[PDB]
Amino acid sequence: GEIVSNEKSGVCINAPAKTKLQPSVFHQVFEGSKEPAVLNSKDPRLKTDFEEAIFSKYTGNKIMLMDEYMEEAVDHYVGCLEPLDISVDPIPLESAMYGMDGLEALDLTTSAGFPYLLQGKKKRDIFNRHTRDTTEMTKMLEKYGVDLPFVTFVKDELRSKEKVEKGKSRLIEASSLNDSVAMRVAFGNLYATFHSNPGTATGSAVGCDPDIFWSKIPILLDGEIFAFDYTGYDASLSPVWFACLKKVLIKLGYTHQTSFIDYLCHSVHLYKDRKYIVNGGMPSGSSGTSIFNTMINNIIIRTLLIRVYKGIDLDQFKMIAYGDDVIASYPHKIDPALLAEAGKHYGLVMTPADKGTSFVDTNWENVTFLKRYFRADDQYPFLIHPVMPMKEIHESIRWTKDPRNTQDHVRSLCYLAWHNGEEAYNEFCRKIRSVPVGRALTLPAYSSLRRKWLDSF
């Protein structure tokens, strides 16, 4: 990803200077070091230029036409997807807006994007989940069209003290409501297929249920495990990776809808009173960002494997990925340090899994996926617990954007926490009930959460 242009947009995007994250009632109870991310360049916590930091993710492009490894990697991934029988047909407008089998309704809580945010117009002024009306969206598609700019927001989230000082805040590139809906029309059936088929054919975990799907993961990835980290994955994508993705879509039957992939690769963005064009890089908050980044990751690993290892047999290779996060398997040991050496040739920055200093071996006890660990059950060791560290749950419970939502928040964290055991769950359930706001909530018991968990298999 490279910013090839920066011009005067003609409009102004005014984002708020103050974060919505306020310390919660549990700010003192539990310990934590994360603070709200830097949103403006005048934040006293800064220790370097804000706009230099947030845009430095664009490290440049490796301009190249698809090499032979990419072509073979593309074919193999197409071969894995062939039995899924993906329909390139478009889904009706009502389903793209309000949902169908395997596709949740479009999220109404986020920005409608350009130009609606400049008109005091929100998604609920066009969308109406109760009536499921489409006439307003049809008129809006007719009036403002497609291939509209993205709106760059600083992501208002918790970050480490280190990333607060270095200004490493993340960005949301919010698609126009027109382009999200139109893209969901073009690729909706593919989204549904992926969401309903997490595994090693899709190589995807998007739309999965960790409670259910964690047990299938070690069965699918039944060989020598390896994993690694990406630094700035989305923005590091060169256009050639978008070309591979296009060739995958073409082999599945897509024709005119590959234009949406061009729309993500060569993208227009609005930030403040600026209008900048990025050559390459995946936008953060486009519809289908997760899946297309997941499909591109399938192409990347395969490409690197063929390039590094001489007589690799991709039909013995298996992987599951969610955006940049990937867990992979091969019968013989694969060293990610050698793969990273090849990924730098393509502009990819691959580093040891989970911020480690060294490249050490990956096993079913240290490996994580979607921040969660793998721990088998004691009574049913064939059932694998997805274990979110209590650390992440403490960092999260300590802040809130809406103290009215404390109940939903805490119980959401209870669905994640009880996988750490009876000891951790009740310690965390006891510390919550240690303040007046706590015991007023409804906290499920360890035995009850377990009851529904095992009833699902």
Q: Can you tell me the distance from the alpha carbon of 62 to that of 64, in angstroms, rounded to the nearest whole number?
A: 6
Give the number of other Cβ atoms within 10 Å of residue 89's Cβ: 9
Side chain identity at residue 18, one-letter code:
K
CB of 290 to ligand GTP, least distance (A): 8
Q: Which two tokens stand for residue 126?
A: 């066009």
CB of 235 to ligand GTP, least distance (A): 7
CB of 355 to ligand GTP, least distance (A): 6
- Residue closer to ligand GTP by CB (options 211, 325) is 325
- Residue closer to ligand GTP by CB (options 121, 155) is 155
Q: Which two tokens stand for residue 133?
A: 């009306």
99 is an annotated ligand-binding site residue: no
Q: Can you tell me the distance from the alpha carbon of 51 to that of 415, in angstroms, rounded to the nearest whole number?
A: 38
Instruction: Mention every residue, 6+ apart, whose C-beta is less than 8 A from residue 404.
Output: none
Q: Can you tell me the distance from the alpha carbon of 398 to that of 29, in angstroms, rounded to the nearest whole number?
A: 8
Q: Say if strands 325-330 and 318-322 run parallel, antiparallel, or are unpaired.
A: antiparallel
CB of 271 to ligand GTP, least distance (A): 13
222 is an annotated ligand-binding site residue: no
Q: If residue 71 lies in a helix (H) or strand (E), which one and from where to where?
A: helix 68-81
Q: Can you tell me the distance from the alpha carbon of 63 to that of 191, in angstroms, rounded to the nearest whole number?
A: 29
CB of 162 to ligand GTP, least distance (A): 9
- Residue closer to ligand GTP by CB (options 13, 432) is 13
CB of 148 to ligand GTP, least distance (A): 19
Q: Which residue has the tokens 């600083």?
A: 154
Q: Can you tell me the distance from the alpha carbon of 454 to that of 40, in angstroms, rounded to the nearest whole number?
A: 47
CB of 106 to ligand GTP, least distance (A): 17
- Residue closer to ligand GTP by CB (options 168, 419) is 168
CB 294 within 8 A of CB 323: yes
190 is an annotated ligand-binding site residue: no
346 is an annotated ligand-binding site residue: no
Closest residue by Cα to residue 30 from 444, 448, 389 = 389
Using CB under 6 A as the criterion, which residues of the chain lie in contact with ligand GTP when the complex forms? 155, 170-172, 229-234, 284, 323-324
- Residue closer to ligand GTP by CB (options 127, 322) is 322
Closest residue by Cα to residue 314 from 239, 238, 203, 234 = 203
171 is an annotated ligand-binding site residue: yes
Instruction: Mention every residue, 6+ apart, whose C-beta is less than 8 A from residue 246.
Output: 258, 261, 262
- Residue closer to ligand GTP by CB (options 59, 87) is 59
Q: Can you tell me the distance from the alpha carbon of 294 to that of 171, in angstroms, rounded to the nearest whole number?
A: 19
CB of 453 to ligand GTP, least distance (A): 27
CB of 110 to ligand GTP, least distance (A): 11
- Residue closer to ligand GTP by CB (options 149, 438) is 149
CB 20 within 8 A of CB 153: no
49 is an annotated ligand-binding site residue: no
- Residue closer to ligand GTP by CB (options 171, 185) is 171
CA angle 187, 192, 197 (to 5 degrees): 130
237 is an annotated ligand-binding site residue: no
CB of 327 to ligand GTP, least distance (A): 16
303 is an annotated ligand-binding site residue: no
- Residue closer to ligand GTP by CB (options 24, 290) is 290
Q: Can you tell me the distance from the alpha carbon of 187 to that of 182, in angstroms, rounded to the nearest whole number?
A: 9
DSSP 219: H
Residue closest to ligand GTP when measured from CB atoms: 284
Instruction: Mention every residue, 6+ apart, whose C-beta is less than 8 A from residue 166.
Output: 47, 48, 53
- Residue closer to ligand GTP by CB (options 371, 450) is 371
Instruction: Mention every residue, 6+ apart, whose C-beta is less than 8 A from residue 269.
Output: 149, 150, 151, 152, 173, 275, 276, 277, 278, 283
Annotated binding site: 159, 163, 170-171, 231-234
Annotated binding site for GTP: 159, 163, 170-171, 231-234
